Amino acid sequence: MNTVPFTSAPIEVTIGIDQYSFNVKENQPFHGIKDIPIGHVHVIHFQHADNSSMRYGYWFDCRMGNFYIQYDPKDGLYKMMEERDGAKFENIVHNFKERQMMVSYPKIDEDDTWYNLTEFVQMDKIRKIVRKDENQFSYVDSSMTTVQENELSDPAHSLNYTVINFKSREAIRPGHEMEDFLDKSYYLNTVMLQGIFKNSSNYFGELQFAFLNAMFFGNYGSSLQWHAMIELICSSATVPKHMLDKLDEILYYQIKTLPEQYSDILLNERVWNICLYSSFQKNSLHNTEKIMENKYPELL
């Protein structure tokens, strides 16, 4: 069980760690979150009380180092940093633990929600979308745009998601124009799976990461990428059966975890209705269709 200690909490802030959130009052005695399950990637995210604008936070894996949060009063935010001296970090953590100045990651023992949302996310892979190689953790906020978004301004601060464009020469073989546009299996299986990702795990991992940036940060470019990667499978007549069954689990937990009052924006009517009711795979997403209809039947 690992720990993200906080030097202090100078400003009133809502802190989120994965799907959990809590309020910290300005200068409340608060020195972090303990008992974080090892073996998954995690996100710690922030929304200031005073400016609900800008959600931001940090993807991280405790197996990759000792990380802590110190507020920076110059730049105005809770920064993640690495402590290189293990002994001194352990000692600081221990005193905070003994004074009980830390909240506890509530690992429900029946609950596999976070595992199911991050099964294919990795920190070596996360750093290929968010580029900042001097740190082992990755910052994301609501305003970061994607590479493709920039094609349609600062490249260093972009989300380098895998560019998907259904009306592109990448997507469309000369001579198969109608074939490849109406059945996207060549682009899914040959260009994307075999060519770029190498395997469906990699495809699923970017899809999972895309959704989680959408939900936690309201990152529009990620929402766009999540839906694009869904739509590419849903629009391929030919998808390995294992990939379909896994996609149905993946979306099920995505839809189950979405806040009820945010579905109106983070869910694209056209893509979902197409995916569930018109596309090749309109019959392959039983769990996802069942929960969508029992929970968000308005969108459809």
Binding site: K167, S168, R169, I172, E177, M178, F181
Partner: protein, 237 residues
């Protein structure tokens, strides 16, 4: 964006463009089978690709053979249309390729867009206008060549005959669209009008009678009457 009433004059500026109409590409007669079911028999079709500035009609005849063994023919038709227009553009020298192609039905944008990925600088545009190019098969010479064709074939006609020698392209396009609108609302009347006077002949290399300026005025008026009229007999007004 879309072409409409407000940007009508752009058709007659000096940027090359083409109208594509696909409404006559897939044509059928619907009939009954021996068992009393209904089946279709395809007949030859055409694509209507028109430079509104010069009058040039690049008529691609669509021979019923292209459908043989194919499914979802109304959907293939749009793609086949798109394939043929892109081929025509590829065939043209660069200084003769359109800068814009305006499709008369929105369902043609994605097919044409995909077929023209190699031409990113050609704008593919819908229109809000209810243009009457569907009636191009009411022009006898046009209809004749399509129905006689035994193989795929591209046929060329100036849809303006020699009008440009006397009137502007704007005026020529308006005449054409009034002629075609009349033909679409009442083909019989429309044609009776065009041919009532046996002394006005249609030249071998023209689609329309050799009216004088003053005979065109009369003609153009009678066509307006028809379109209003039928709009009465169609709305009891």
């Amino acid at each position: 964006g879309a072409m409409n009433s407000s940007n009508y004059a752009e058709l007659f500026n000096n940027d090359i463009k083409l109208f594509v109409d696909d409404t006559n590409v897939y044509r059928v007669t619907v009939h009954k089978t021996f068992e009393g079911n209904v089946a279709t028999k395809a007949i030859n079709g055409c694509i209507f690709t028109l430079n509104p500035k010069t009058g040039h009609l690049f008529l691609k005849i669509i021979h019923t053979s292209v459908w043989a063994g194919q499914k979802r023919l109304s959907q293939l038709a749009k793609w086949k249309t798109a394939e043929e227009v892109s081929a025509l553009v590829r065939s043209l020298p660069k200084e003769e390729q359109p800068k814009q192609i305006i499709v008369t039905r929105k369902a043609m944008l994605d097919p044409l867009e995909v077929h023209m990925l190699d031409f990113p600088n050609i704008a593919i545009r819908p229109t809000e206008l209810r243009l009457p190019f569907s009636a191009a098969m009411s022009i006898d010479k046009l209809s004749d060549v399509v129905m006689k064709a035994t193989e795929p074939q591209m046929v060329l006609f100036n849809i303006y005959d020699d009008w440009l020698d006397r009137i502007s392209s704007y005026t020529a396009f308006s005449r054409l669209t009034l002629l075609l609108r009349a033909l679409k609302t009442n083909e019989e009347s429309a044609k009776m009008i065009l041919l009532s006077d046996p002394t006005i002949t249609i030249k071998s290399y023209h689609l329309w009678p050799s009216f004088t300026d003053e005979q065109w005025i009369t003609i153009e008026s009678q066509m307006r009457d028809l379109i209003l009229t039928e709009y009465g007999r169609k709305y009891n007004v």
